[PDB]
Ligand binder design. Sequence first.
Ligand SMILES: CCCNC(=O)CCNC(=O)[C@H](O)C(C)(C)COP(=O)(O)OP(=O)(O)OC[C@H]1O[C@@H](n2cnc3c(N)ncnc32)[C@H](O)[C@@H]1OP(=O)(O)O
Ligand SMILES: CCCNC(=O)CCNC(=O)[C@H](O)C(C)(C)COP(=O)(O)OP(=O)(O)OC[C@H]1O[C@@H](n2cnc3c(N)ncnc32)[C@H](O)[C@@H]1OP(=O)(O)O
Ligand SMILES: [Cl-]
Ligand SMILES: [Cl-]
Ligand SMILES: [Cl-]
Lengths: 503, 512
Amino acid sequence: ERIRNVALRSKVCPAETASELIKHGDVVGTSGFTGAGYPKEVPKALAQRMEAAHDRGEKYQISLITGASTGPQLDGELAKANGVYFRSPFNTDATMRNRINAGETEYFDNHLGQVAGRAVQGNYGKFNIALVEATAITEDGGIVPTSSVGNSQTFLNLAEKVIIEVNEWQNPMLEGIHDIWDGNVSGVPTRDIVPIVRADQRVGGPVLRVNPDKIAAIVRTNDRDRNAPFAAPDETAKAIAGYLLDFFGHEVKQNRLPPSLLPLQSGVGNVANAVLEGLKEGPFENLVGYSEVIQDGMLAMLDSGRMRIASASSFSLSPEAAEEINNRMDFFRSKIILRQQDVSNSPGIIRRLGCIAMNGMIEADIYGNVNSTRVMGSKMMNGIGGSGDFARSSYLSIFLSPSTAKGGKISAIVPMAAHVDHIMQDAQIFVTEQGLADLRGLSPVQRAREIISKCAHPDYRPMLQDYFDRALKNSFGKHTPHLLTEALSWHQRFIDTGTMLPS
Amino acid sequence: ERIRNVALRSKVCPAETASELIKHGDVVGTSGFTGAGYPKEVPKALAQRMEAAHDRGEKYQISLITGASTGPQLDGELAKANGVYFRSPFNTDATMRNRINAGETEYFDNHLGQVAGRAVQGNYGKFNIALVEATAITEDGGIVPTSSVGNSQTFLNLAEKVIIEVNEWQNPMLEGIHDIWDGNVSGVPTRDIVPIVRADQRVGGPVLRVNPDKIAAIVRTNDRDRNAPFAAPDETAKAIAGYLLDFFGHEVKQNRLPPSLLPLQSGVGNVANAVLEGLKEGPFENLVGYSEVIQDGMLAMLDSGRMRIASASSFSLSPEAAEEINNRMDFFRSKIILRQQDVSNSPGIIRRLGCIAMNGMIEADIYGNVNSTRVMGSKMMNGIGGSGDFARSSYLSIFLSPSTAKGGKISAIVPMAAHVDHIMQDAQIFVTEQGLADLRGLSPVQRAREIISKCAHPDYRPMLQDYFDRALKNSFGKHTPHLLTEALSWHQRFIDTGTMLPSSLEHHHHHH
Ligand SMILES: CCCNC(=O)CCNC(=O)[C@H](O)C(C)(C)COP(=O)(O)OP(=O)(O)OC[C@H]1O[C@@H](n2cnc3c(N)ncnc32)[C@H](O)[C@@H]1OP(=O)(O)O
Ligand SMILES: CCCNC(=O)CCNC(=O)[C@H](O)C(C)(C)COP(=O)(O)OP(=O)(O)OC[C@H]1O[C@@H](n2cnc3c(N)ncnc32)[C@H](O)[C@@H]1OP(=O)(O)O
Ligand SMILES: [Cl-]
Ligand SMILES: [Cl-]
Ligand SMILES: [Cl-]
């Protein structure tokens, strides 16, 4: 029995009835982070009732605030129903992405570590509903989270009414893996000092806390987390990993990093995951993770023993990896700590621990400004996520990408980024399959020489050098030379012709 | 006597001789932050010898790393001499700015709170010289800083050799105003918890620490800081301050801020001065500053009790205010704390205290991304400074600017910023003399509607609205609509014609 508090069993009701607690205009905070631990059955019932209401000519939309990305049962279903008027902070569902890029759902991708604080400040409005997935409800009424923690504790604090989905699909042995801190991380200033001084330090307890009087409904569910698999590292990804591992090796040899490196943060995506695959058989032992997420590769690192322990807010496992950890939860449970996302992504803690940040990117310009989010400057991919949290706060900020995209039709190194998420100051190292650019110490024109020569694809490098050389001659100022008549012209060329390569 | 350690008196020597310790190629770390507490006599002597070398075909340049901005005697003299091959992290000297924008001095404007850490990591190379201005040297060889702390403790730690300038112009009773911590803020990980939980909290001691064996020279000096003329509020600044104070008043009446607000950070200038004058007149009490700087307007508030404490790394005072804080240093030393800049600008502390950040800007685009640094995308003004430290970490991030620049020929609200320092996520409130845009809760298209309607100048609003409307119809995606063919075209128009305003001899979509 998952609901171990006998009194709360009287609150069990159908998902459909529970969804009726959610009214047009409601601000709804949910569990869910990188396709892990989001509610499933209540959103589906909601979505159907929304569609019905729209047909009758009744407005029915909500504001949906999450930990980060969710899954087809939540973002997918509600987007199909046209039922979300505002979404924050991070999405990876294709149907919701389409709503966002069509202007049908309003979207703001906050820094993930800041979302709890902004919610408490009231930036999203009053929380009408918290909808949280649980593994179990303890005898004293504690809510055991599932495969993520995210913002669930904050949403439970803020919400007028609480709906809990108790998901029998989730592993009962997850209980104990979470660390939920009682202190003021994201509340009214002055905030508390968070006493984490080692990446493996537990400072909290295993359950979310909530006043039982606020629980309006408990829904028994049975449905799987769903996420995409990662691309098995190809020649490009392996080349990137090789350059980065060589780099770490040199840093250690020059005594600029310990032999066990520093706590590692590995971002979302295939490239970051391939680096981890490299590290699992690498020359750095006793590694520690202090990350936003644990992807397949990090789990692989724990398995090989190269990494001793990993801190994160969530799992981001492929279907096959997810099945792996559940068969072996007793081996992995002691190697993993799942924290609130305002703690995993705390800039104070990230800087204190000296994290190494490794993140993907859409594109960088020749001066090493980075776009993580908006293709051609206007079309959202996923969101900034915690990449800003970690890039700015880290000891070393590394960005990783194939040098081209769309089968060579796009250069990932451009004259000017069409959108900036990470400024020059927040990016020190760039790696593509062409090589590695170490920008420490360098002015912007010196950054450009390194990025162009080390990272750009041979198809595009002469064009980039041509832009830079002519900018140096003709730019308004020479500190960060640009030709404004053509800075964004490669992007426009792609829009116009389907390729950044001239005819 | 300012040098109270007898042994160190033997290292006193003339400025010119001290300057000979600095060699071509050297990396030099100096005191100096917002025009306060930078060395003066040794840089002047160095510049002379640099020029003399150059005249004989001999190379002589240094790398100059500071706290932040310095003044004519340092950045000015060395720039005139063409003596600086690399400069970091922040400059406001006009001659040095010209070297930077001509490509004669390489420049990187690091986040001010990060500079110490990157120096310790080795990003600037090995420090050959630390050149630091002092009020006094204590009996046990402690170095009492002057009108700023900046990065001086880190530079003293890293440098192979140390030169101290003891400046008798600086009031002796500055001793005690500084708080220097020996804790690991910017050293090798894992770093220490910095335990500051109140803006008035001291965690360290009154002196910089240095192994006396590294002190190669001490120079007796007597010269003024750069006390920039008071920037008297004009009507634009007063309007901006008016909107901001009205906003604060409303936040308090809605219980989203205490009647004592939260610790305040402001940049320097016209607008900040108007805001400080407004606070002195307003309905708020028990104010607290946690900032980079002490500005003129604070002294009156510390005097009256309106402000209880001001934390900063430096003084940023007019001649009037600078001489008044001197004649009353016994009083003001109890009301002010000067900290290392890696503590004044610590993101963890700024967030913990819940600072309200109020910063200037070159321009913002319609979606509320902010340029603080690079005019037309390529020409450096001053540098990012601590604006990223505070904007990102603050409880509320506010950007304040006239809606136009260059006598109306530039719009400070543009289709696309030519350079970005602060992304949308780091900017919640915009204020111009046209009004205040509160962007909390808003998507980028919603941000644009508020920025265009509240902040843009009437001469530019129709052009902005036209760009936005056509972008909404034609952009590659509609999440942050752009027209890449014309996104930077207002900037190019300024480069080519000296104005962003269009000619009616040509078609423009908003004219119809
Ligand atoms: C600690 C917080 C970490 N979180 C974050 O960094 C969140 C933001 N980052 C991200 O979303 C991902 O890292 C990125 C930026 C999408 C990169 O992901 P990744 O390493 O898996 O890259 P990958 O090369 O596989 O490309 C992923 C997608 O982006 C597309 N893409 C990547 N670079 C692109 C570019 N320069 N232009 C256009 N599309 C691009 C790529 O085509 C693919 O989309 P489709 O499958 O074709 O629809
Ligand atoms: C806590 C750390 C705070 N530190 C920082 O914010 C450092 C970065 N910020 C800064 O340097 C300043 O806030 C800014 C952005 C230069 C604005 O300065 P300010 O608020 O005193 O405004 P002000 O209108 O006086 O402008 C300063 C200069 O920039 C120029 N300027 C301002 N906006 C401009 C624009 N949109 N286009 C071109 N020039 C512009 C202005 O003409 C003036 O130049 P001059 O010295 O007369 O040749
Ligand atoms: Cl650097
Ligand atoms: Cl801290
Ligand atoms: Cl917000």
